[model samples]
Target: GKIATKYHGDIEIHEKDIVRFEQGIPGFLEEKQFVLLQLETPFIILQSVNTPALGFVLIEPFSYFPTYEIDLDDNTLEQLQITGEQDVALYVILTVADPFDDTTANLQAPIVINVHKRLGKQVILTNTNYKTKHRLFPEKVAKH
Candidate 1:
């Protein structure tokens, strides 16, 4: 129930809060279990419950990229037991940097999770217009 996090220190999370990533999140394959912690509005931390150092900054893509969308295959939906649209919550991994504008979110491979099922997966999109590094503040893109 209690675990050490990258930035949140030690905290208590319920069993239901642990999200299982069977294939892991790209580079951190061995780190399967994770908990979502709110760091700030539109930003949350997906810290591995098993490995403190294995964590990622996530943001609801729709908050910043309203046009962003993901299409899940039948296999992925069946694995997570996703019954409908309401059962899913989407988040994009972010690289928060020194200058806020320089911060980027991975839009091409968004983290897809099942809310009630407590399962997650990082899915790579095909035939999509999005990419990995989309600046959070594009107005400052030229300044940086």
Candidate 2:
């Protein structure tokens, strides 16, 4: 089927490519279906299957934060029908800043997807120090 996206324009996608979020996302409760579109850069687009203009920029947390980790509770594991670690894929939503380099990632709630089942959910972490906005690039001093 054909679908319009915020960044990639209109494109054709297969039914199997759509990821189903049974409970929907946090704020966007109506958006249950989404597709992951890869760009030339490291970022990926989590495009709403129905809403063309609605899409989110996502990044693999581990790529930027190597030490980043999260434990999926038994409930989430069962909800997504996840059985093993190998079938899981994780990504954090990016809040694009004006300077681009200042973009922040929402580490508190990471998007968890079951690759094998095509099921997804935004899992909010508790009892942790993670925040909604974590700078993608840390400030570095420049010598004059």
Candidate 3:
């Protein structure tokens, strides 16, 4: 189907490609239908059904922190209808920085998607170690 989005213009996407968030994003409570657009190198844009140009950058937490661990409650697992560990893909919202130097990702609040079911839910971890703004790069550049 041809989805009119604020990002990537009016891109035609297959029905199976659509991810449905029944409870919606944390801030965006109205938008439920979204598509994940892979941007070649840096990020993946989550395009909403109501708006096109509005895309949110997302990245896999494991890509940056391989040792990250999360506890899945029964409710959340049932909500996503998760049947197997391999059937799920989790991503966190990325905050791109200026000058292409500083960047950070919100590891506490992660968007978990069940690939097999095409459904997603934003999960907030209880761990205090994970912060909303964990810097990805060095705080200070080399004085040289």
lDDT of 2 at 77: 97
Candidate 2 residue pairs in backbone clash: none
Q: Which candidate is the best by lDDT?
A: 2
Candidate 1 lDDT over residue span 67-117, tens digit each: 887788888888888999899999999988887778888898988899888
TM-score of 1: 0.92
The C-alpha RMSD of each candidate to the native structure, in angstroms, is 2.0, 2.0, 2.2
Q: Using TM-score, rank the candidates from best to worst.
A: 2, 1, 3
lDDT tens digits, residue span 3-121, model 3? 77654677788888889999998888787998999876657888886677568888887777677678877899999999878989988888888855588889889889999789999
Writing each residue's lDDT as its tens digit, candidate 2 over 89-111 gives: 99999999988888899999999
Better of 1 and 2 by TM-score: 2
Top-TM-score candidate index: 2
Residue 137, candidate 2: Cα error in Å is: 1.1
